[PDB]
Amino acid sequence: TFTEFTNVEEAKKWGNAQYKKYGLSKPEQEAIKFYTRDASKINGPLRANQGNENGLPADILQKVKLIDQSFSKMKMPQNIILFRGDDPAYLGPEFQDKILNKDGTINKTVFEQVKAKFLKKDRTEYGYISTSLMSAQFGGRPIVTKFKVTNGSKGGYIDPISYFPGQLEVLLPRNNSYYISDMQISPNNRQIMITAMIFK
Question: Which annotated residues bind NAD(+)?
Answer without folding.
Answer: 36, 43, 47, 84-87, 123-125, 138-141, 167-169
